[PDB]
Amino acid sequence: DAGIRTLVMLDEQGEQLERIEEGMDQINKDMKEAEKNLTDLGSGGFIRRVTNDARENEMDENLEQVSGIIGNLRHMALDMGNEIDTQNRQIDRIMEKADSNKTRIDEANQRATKMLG
Amino acid sequence: MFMDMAMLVESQGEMIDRIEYNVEHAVDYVERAVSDTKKAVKYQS
Amino acid sequence: TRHSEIIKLENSIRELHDMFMDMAMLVESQGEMIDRIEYNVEHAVDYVERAVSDTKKAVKYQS
Amino acid sequence: GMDTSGKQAEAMALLAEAERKVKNSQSFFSGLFGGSSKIEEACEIYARAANMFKMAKNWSAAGNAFCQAAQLHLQLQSKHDAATCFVDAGNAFKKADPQEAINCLMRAIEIYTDMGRFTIAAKHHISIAEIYETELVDVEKAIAHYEQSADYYKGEESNSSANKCLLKVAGYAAQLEQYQKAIDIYEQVGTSAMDSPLLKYSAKDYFFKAALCHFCIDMLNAKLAVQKYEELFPAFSDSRECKLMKKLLEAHEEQNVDSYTESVKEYDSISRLDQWLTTMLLRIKKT
Amino acid sequence: GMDTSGKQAEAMALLAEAERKVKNSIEEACEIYARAANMFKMAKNWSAAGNAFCQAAQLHLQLQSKHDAATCFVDAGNAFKKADPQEAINCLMRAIEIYTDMGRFTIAAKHHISIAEIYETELVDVEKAIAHYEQSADYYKGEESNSSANKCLLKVAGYAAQLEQYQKAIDIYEQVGTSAMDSPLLKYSAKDYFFKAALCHFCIDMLNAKLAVQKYEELFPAFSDSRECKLMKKLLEAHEEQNVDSYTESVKEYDSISRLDQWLTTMLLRIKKTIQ
Amino acid sequence: GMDTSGKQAEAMALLAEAERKVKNSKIEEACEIYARAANMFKMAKNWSAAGNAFCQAAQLHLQLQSKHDAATCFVDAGNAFKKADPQEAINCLMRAIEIYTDMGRFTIAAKHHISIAEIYETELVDVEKAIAHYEQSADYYKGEESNSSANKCLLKVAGYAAQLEQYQKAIDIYEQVGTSAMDSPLLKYSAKDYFFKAALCHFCIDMLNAKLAVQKYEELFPAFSDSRECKLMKKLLEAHEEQNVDSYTESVKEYDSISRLDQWLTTMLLRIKKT
């Protein structure tokens, strides 16, 4: 259950990351357009049952089930793992964009304040 | 350790939501500023 | 058969362990980066708001 | 401590000063036409008073100050900052005065949706539904707001968020003794989730719940739906859920309630059960 | 290498230039001072860099600037963090005050958490750390950050149970367990908290511990099936019989099944000491 | 192929037109058109010519009043030269790092430092240059409170020093990072590995003090006993007490059935065993 919850939450995080990247791209394009316009304005057993007995059976069965579940978990986990790499890359790529945007706006303001006097 | 990791994932989700909301506010204001600049330039010109 | 199955189970455990530490470290790095961008975007929005407010007040003073 | 008395006194003084400033603003405008600078300064003072009240733990006063600032700045033709103050009032009054927060959030929703910002309107609708469900037992209002938010998000093509709202609505509806809607919603979510590698693993759970929801209607359709789910999603057959439903159906076929309860108890021992599933199983067991 | 002496001399020259520029009486002076402080940071001269940052922040704040002033004050605090913890804490306090005036409660709460962390790790003071952590928790609860609030409350309860009276510990632990019970993912861990609560009550009295653990068992059905409940009942029996051997044997068995946090060891030591 | 020749001809024509335009206020247009020509080379994938054009356009922009654009062009030129004369890429990236550092942007400077160290270590045989760059980046990150990047760089330098037979720095860094991870509530799972590695390295120094080192590690971290690494290493040490080849070979083969050992670990184990 914890594994499944982890998967779904990571998927939601990735979707929101994509949406914020789109928003950042739109912000950058709009800011560039506005600045330009403004500038242009100017398995057989697990334990040997020494005494046989039911007990030695049940444990074995339990182990079997355990192993199977673990098997499944492995693959699931790997799949979950994959997502992070992509998200990380996207995140890094937006960092730069945003930073540049900020820098630009800063200098833009200074520019608008230096021609006046 | 699985249980521990789940909480980190949840924290990442919530902070992502907050960042997205702030970005929505910022982009909406930027769009409004672009519209205002277009109006000003069109009318002054 | 006992050796094979026990060894396979332990190998799966080892693979899970190493993969999960790797992904947890990467998730910690991602969380730190997201925390950074939070303040980055907050500062960016605040500064652009202040600059545009300055532009508004200046243009209204001049006209 | 000193915080309570000091913040209360200083906030009262600042609010009185703002009230006097707004009182004299009319005379200043009439005699000199100062413009809107005085109103903006008064709004700043009111926002400061709201912030101090919030730090003072007097939520009601902070919410009232935010509402006053929202009204005053809306009078200034600035709908965006007015909506911001209205949302602040809604999230401040949420705990102190739930009804006041409700109308504040409704006003914020109206102002935002006037501009087409559907995401913020949907978030506010979700907040209203959550408050309604948590505080009040008015299930209908929560369902209506959840459906509206899900529609808003669907119109934005933001998948994976409307699904959870629809699932919540379907579960609450099933709790309200309306099963056709719950069956349809659960089946729709399951069929939307099969193709997803990540969610596929959880898909089985959805199927199981749906099959349980159809159990009350009649046994024959329950068996038929079990067959359809097994044939359409063969992987579902591997899960213990199919075995559990088959054992339960076998127990019911012979009025063998004892086997039914033994199986339920064993499964609960293996994994603790949820309130919804417990209630559904108990209601079924009445027959 | 040349880095040390060259950057130090350049920083002295830049400081002198800024002092001369201000003597004429302005943002150029602040920029020069910030560059000098950055160069000092590069030269590994952490000291006197926070001083430069503070001077630049004061000069820029003199003309109503508050955002960059707060950021530079926080940076100066970070620089002094290792060189001089006390002045770094003072700078962080000033930044917290500025942010609270602006209303950025999240930044103030994070800085409060940092202040408590530095107080607890470098200096020896728990009251200041507890107060700052509680302030950060209140700030975040104003921002409805449940996870951070729960973590801070857990830290406060841990400190209180370690040294302070057990009343605060029991209150916080009961609140945390009640809050966590409803959560589907976090419900299972509630048992742990409940166990801790029981331990605290046993640190007060055995009768209170027994009554509280029975009440918790009624409250949390899974707690009955938890190994912690069985171990606690056996320990209560051993303590009531004044039988230390049962205490030691049960502790060894629990250690064999699972290791000890070294905090449960301290609480068990306290309980064993009072058997008499 | 026709596509490669067509792209080369298009981009050469664009550069020729850019030269004619600039040779004929004009600085901004010249820089823009030169950037376009450099991009057209990069799309044409003439790595040497693309990088040359990129650095020339970056220099022309440097002639223009701008800093961020200069750094962006420099990083683009470094990326282009990645598959060309490594010295030019290193020089351009060093200049970009210096420009970023002078502006106070230490994080991107540290990233570029890591990149240049990576290329220097992977392409050429001189490892000490990469060690110095990685250490500089780690110091910068530590100054910026970046614990993760500093930890990774410290691990890499410790491993390289251990490989180079300078085991003292390796053990010091391993122990410091292990205790740092132990202090934090998280990262404990890895601490064991660090301790084990440290022990092995110290064992390369001698055998008598290896017992003391492992006893210190155990008393410092009791849970380290449960690690299979401790059992393997103690059996290896006990076998090493006698000049017998079978015992430690059998121990390592038994351990290796679960997971395959890394190249460095195997090469250190063989080094210790052979002598």
SS3 per residue for chain D? CHHHHHHHHHHHHHHHHHHHHHHHHHHHHHHHCCCCHHHHHHHHHHHHHHHHHHHCCCHHHHHHHHHHHHHHHHCCCCHHHHHHHHHHHHHHHHHHCHHHHHHHHHHHHHHHHHCCCHHHHHHHHHHHHHHHHHHCCCHHHHHHHHHHHHHHHHHCCCCCCHHHHHHHHHHHHHHCCCHHHHHHHHHHHHHHHHCCHHHHHHHHHHHHHHHHHCCCCCHHHHHHHHHHHHHHCHHHHHCHHHHHHHHHHHHHHCCCHHHHHHHHHHHHHHCCCCHHHHHHHHHHHCC
The Cα F169–Cα F171 span in angstroms is 6
**F243 phi-psi bin (left φ>0, alpha ψ -120 to 50, beta other):** beta
**A44 phi-psi bin (left φ>0, alpha ψ -120 to 50, beta other):** left
Distances (CA, A) of E214 to E190, E210, E254: 15, 6, 21
Give partners of A (≥3 CB pairs < 8 A): B, C, D, E
Which one-letter amino acid corresponds to residue F144? E
Tokens 């052979």 — which residue? F274
CB within 8 Å: E78 and F223 = no
CA dihedral D16, D19, D23, D29 (to 10 degrees): 120
Q: Residue F34 has which token pair?
A: 């030169």
The Cα F117–Cα D188 span in angstroms is 54
Picking from E147, E188, E189, the nearest residue to B10 by CB comes out as: E147
What residues of A are in the C interface, CB distance below 8 Å? 43-47, 67, 70-71, 73-74, 77-78, 80-81, 84-85, 87-88, 91-92, 94-95, 98-99, 101-102, 105-106, 108-109, 112-113, 116
A115 burial (CB, 10 Å; 0-12 / 13-18 / 19+) is exposed
Q: Which of E:178-197 have CB within 8 Å of A? A: 185
| F147-163 and F167-183 helices, crossing angle to 10° | 150
Q: Is D170 within 8 Å of D190 (Cβ atoms)?
A: no
Give me the half-sphere count of Cα atoms (radius 13 Å) on the Cβ side of residue F47: 11
Q: What angle do CA D105, D109, D110 make, to 5 degrees?
A: 120
Distances (CA, A) of D93 to D82, D99, D121, D129: 16, 8, 18, 16
Q: Residue E166 has which token pair?
A: 């057990």
φ and ψ of D76, to 5 deg = -90, 10
Q: Which of F155, F204, F161, F160 is nearest to F178 (CA)?
A: F155
Which one-letter amino acid corresponds to residue B3? M
Q: Residue E271 has which token pair?
A: 């309980």
The Cα E268–Cα F54 span in angstroms is 70
The Cα D15–Cα D42 span in angstroms is 9
Per-residue burial over E143-168, b if 16 or more Cβ lie within 10 Å, else e, is eebeebbbbbbebbbebbbeeeebeb
The Cα E95–Cα E102 span in angstroms is 11
| F147-163 and F263-274 helices, crossing angle to 10° | 40
**How many of the other CB atoms lie within 10 Å of CB of D12?**
14
F162-171 contacts, C-beta under 8 A, 24 or more apart:
F162/F197, F162/F201, F162/F264, F162/F268, F163/F264, F164/F127, F165/F204, F167/F201, F167/F202, F167/F204, F167/F205, F170/F197, F170/F198, F170/F201, F171/F198, F171/F201, F171/F202
The Cα A22–Cα A98 span in angstroms is 12
Q: Is E255 within 8 Å of E221 (Cβ atoms)?
A: no
Q: Is E60 within 8 Å of E31 (Cβ atoms)?
A: no
Q: Is D28 within 8 Å of D42 (Cβ atoms)?
A: no
Contact with chain C for residue F189, Cβ under 8 A: yes
Distances (CA, A) of E111 to B17, E90, E124, F145: 22, 11, 19, 15
* Residues, chain D: 287
| F68-81 and F86-102 helices, crossing angle to 10° | 160
**H or E, element range at A82:** helix A53-114
**How many of the other CB atoms lie within 10 Å of CB of F126?**
10
Per-residue burial over E95-131, b if 16 or more Cβ lie within 10 Å, else e, is bbebbbeebbbbbbbbbbbbbbebbbeeeeeeeebbb
Tell me which chain E residue has its CA closest to the CA of residue A5. E185
The Cα D14–Cα D50 span in angstroms is 10
Q: In angstroms, what separates the C-alpha of C43 from chain B's closest C-alpha?
A: 11
- On chain F, the residues whose CB falls within 8 A of the CB of E38 are 104
* Number of B–E residue contacts, CB under 8 Å: 9
Q: Residue F4 has which token pair?
A: 């490669």
Picking from E34, E35, E259, the nearest residue to F223 by CB comes out as: E259
- Which of D198, D202, D206, D277 best probes binding to A when mutated, by most A CB atoms within 10 angstroms? D198
Q: In angstroms, what separates the C-alpha of F212 from chain C's closest C-alpha?
A: 29
Terminal CA-CA length for chain F = 58
Distances (CA, A) of D107 to A10, D64, D67, D125, E242: 34, 15, 11, 11, 68
E23 burial (CB, 10 Å; 0-12 / 13-18 / 19+) is exposed
Tokens 């507890």 — which residue? E130
Per-residue burial over D43-55, b if 16 or more Cβ lie within 10 Å, else e, is bebbbbbbbbbbb
The Cα E105–Cα E110 span in angstroms is 9
The Cα D98–Cα A106 span in angstroms is 42
Tokens 């990685």 — which residue? F134
Q: Residue F197 has which token pair?
A: 């590695």
Residue F223 carries which DSSP code?
G
A106 burial (CB, 10 Å; 0-12 / 13-18 / 19+) is middle
The Cα A107–Cα B6 span in angstroms is 43
Contact with chain E for residue F104, Cβ under 8 A: yes
The Cα C11–Cα C5 span in angstroms is 10
Which one-letter amino acid corresponds to residue F76? D
Distances (CA, A) of E44 to B16, E6, E50, E246, F218: 35, 12, 12, 59, 36
Which one-letter amino acid corresponds to residue A9? M
Per DSSP, the three-state class of A89 is: helix
Q: Which of E224, E245, E226 is nearest to E235 (CA)?
A: E245
Q: Is D72 within 8 Å of D39 (Cβ atoms)?
A: yes
Q: Is F114 within 8 Å of F153 (Cβ atoms)?
A: yes
Distances (CA, A) of B38 to D248, D279, F200: 69, 61, 70
Q: Residue C12 has which token pair?
A: 């799966």
**How many of the other CB atoms lie within 10 Å of CB of C51?**
18
The Cα F108–Cα E37 span in angstroms is 19
CB within 8 Å: B9 and C27 = yes
Q: Is E154 within 8 Å of E137 (Cβ atoms)?
A: no
Distances (CA, A) of F161 to E139, F39, F156, F166, F262: 47, 41, 9, 5, 17
Q: In angstroms, what separates the C-alpha of B32 from chain A's closest C-alpha?
A: 10
The Cα F209–Cα F199 span in angstroms is 10
* Residues, chain E: 276
Contact with chain A for residue D119, Cβ under 8 A: no
**Cβ contacts of A60 within 8 Å, gap of 6 or more:** A45, A46, A47
**H or E, element range at C30:** helix C2-62
Distances (CA, A) of D251 to D210, D248, D260, E179, F50: 20, 5, 6, 38, 77
- Which of B20, B22, B24 best probes binding to D when mutated, by most D CB atoms within 10 angstroms? B24
E69 burial (CB, 10 Å; 0-12 / 13-18 / 19+) is buried
Which experimental technique did the depositors report for determining this structure? Answer: cryo-EM
E90 burial (CB, 10 Å; 0-12 / 13-18 / 19+) is middle
D271 burial (CB, 10 Å; 0-12 / 13-18 / 19+) is exposed
The Cα E149–Cα E138 span in angstroms is 8
Q: Is F195 within 8 Å of F188 (Cβ atoms)?
A: no
The Cα D46–Cα D49 span in angstroms is 5
Terminal CA-CA length for chain B = 65
Which one-letter amino acid corresponds to residue F152? K
Q: Is D250 within 8 Å of D226 (Cβ atoms)?
A: no
Q: Residue D91 has which token pair?
A: 């999230």
Picking from E103, E184, E222, the nearest residue to D51 by CB comes out as: E103
Q: Which of D76, D95, D72 is nearest to D86 (CA)?
A: D72
Residue F225 carries which DSSP code?
G
The Cα A29–Cα A33 span in angstroms is 6
The Cα E195–Cα E212 span in angstroms is 10
The Cα D41–Cα D29 span in angstroms is 14
Q: Residue A29 has which token pair?
A: 């394009």
